């Protein structure tokens, strides 16, 4: 019932990845809410369940497939299905808990992890920070296999957490930020894997801050500056929405705009 987007690592190109991320963006928002030239995701409050999720069906060189479910309100992975099993992160609240019950309802084996899926938990469980986990087509290929094998005990928890970290950044974060999409496109283009640098990590850390600053801004002007990082790790401040237009592709909903 929910919309499905397909991607395969097998033969992946800059083109196929580009079309993949653009399709994900197109399914996340209707483009009806744009602020300072940046789209805002649907507001969770009052959102019909039929509009709440999209599915990303991933395949790899081994022709194994897993389907991630993404919450359109944050573009984030809430769980996945692999064959006849589905797994969900522990929901933060009753509403989200009720919402995920609508996912993967024909799957015979259904499991909700005791732990949630924010980066702090995933990094902890993986035994690695994002800075030390390689991204690219190769890592994505491997994560898909790891995810696929969890249900039969072929994958240990920390490997599963690392796999989630890879999927989330190459799909969720890429959709959220043209900049990070660009980082993955580069890796794909030159057939390389590499950990994300401080610019990517700090962007990820700042998605909420940027969303808030832009949406609460006084006619584009930030109430307070937001510090970001260059590729080399050095720090710089952003004071307004304009410089962020080429960087951010989607914002989490914070508040309503004026007419």
């Amino acid at each position, epitope marked *: 019932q929910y919309p499905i987007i397909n991607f395969t690592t097998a033969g992946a190109t800059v083109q196929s990845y580009t079309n993949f991320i653009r399709a994900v963006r197109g399914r996340l928002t209707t483009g009806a809410d744009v602020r300072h030239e940046i789209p805002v995701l649907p507001n969770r409050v009052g959102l019909p369940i039929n509009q709440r999720f999209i599915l990303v069906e991933l395949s790899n060189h081994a022709e194994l497939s897993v389907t991630l479910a993404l919450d359109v*309100t*944050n573009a*984030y992975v809430v769980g996945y299905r692999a064959g006849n099993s589905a797994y969900f992160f522990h929901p*933060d609240n009753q509403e*989200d808990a009720e919402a995920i019950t609508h996912l993967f309802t024909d799957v015979q084996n259904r499991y909700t992890f005791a732990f949630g*899926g*924010n*980066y*702090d*938990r995933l990094e902890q469980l993986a035994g690695n*920070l994002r800075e030390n986990i390689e991204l690219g087509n190769g890592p994505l290929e491997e994560a898909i296999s790891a995810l696929y094998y969890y249900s039969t005990g072929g994958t240990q928890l920390p490997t599963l957490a690392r796999s989630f970290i890879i999927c989330i950044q190459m799909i*969720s974060e890429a959709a959220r930020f043209q900049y990070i999409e660009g980082e993955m496109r580069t890796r794909i283009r030159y057939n390389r894997r590499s950990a994300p640098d401080p610019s990517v990590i700090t962007l990820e*850390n*700042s*998605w*909420g*801050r940027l*969303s*808030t600053a832009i949406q609460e801004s006084n006619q584009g002007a930030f109430a*307070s*500056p937001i*510090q970001l990082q260059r590729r080399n790790g050095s720090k710089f401040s952003v*004071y307004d929405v304009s410089i962020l237009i080429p960087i951010i592709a989607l914002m*989490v909903y914070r508040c309503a705009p004026p007419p």
Partner: nanobody
Amino acid sequence: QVQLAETGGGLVQPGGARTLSCAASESISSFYFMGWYRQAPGKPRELVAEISNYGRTDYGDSLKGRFTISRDNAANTVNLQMNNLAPEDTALYYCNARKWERSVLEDYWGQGTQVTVSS
């Protein structure tokens, strides 16, 4: 809704010192980062120091060696030791806590504590 409470602000002479403490309404380990920021006269709010759940620290330019941010897991606080103070350090200081919620790293802020350095 996390609550943060700051103490330690006041009036000191140059070369003076302060210990700012931030108490939280939940375990500080719940937070991915905690920080101290300051808003000086005429200036925008800026970073003084941040510390992560794993002891990684970062400091605003020129504040390393002068200020120290530290966690106290027993007291459940994040603290800012401020040494050899100068008029330039006059500002409202804010405690910050950053918590992942629904995949978004959310900010919480104390009401602020004034530090004034006067000769």
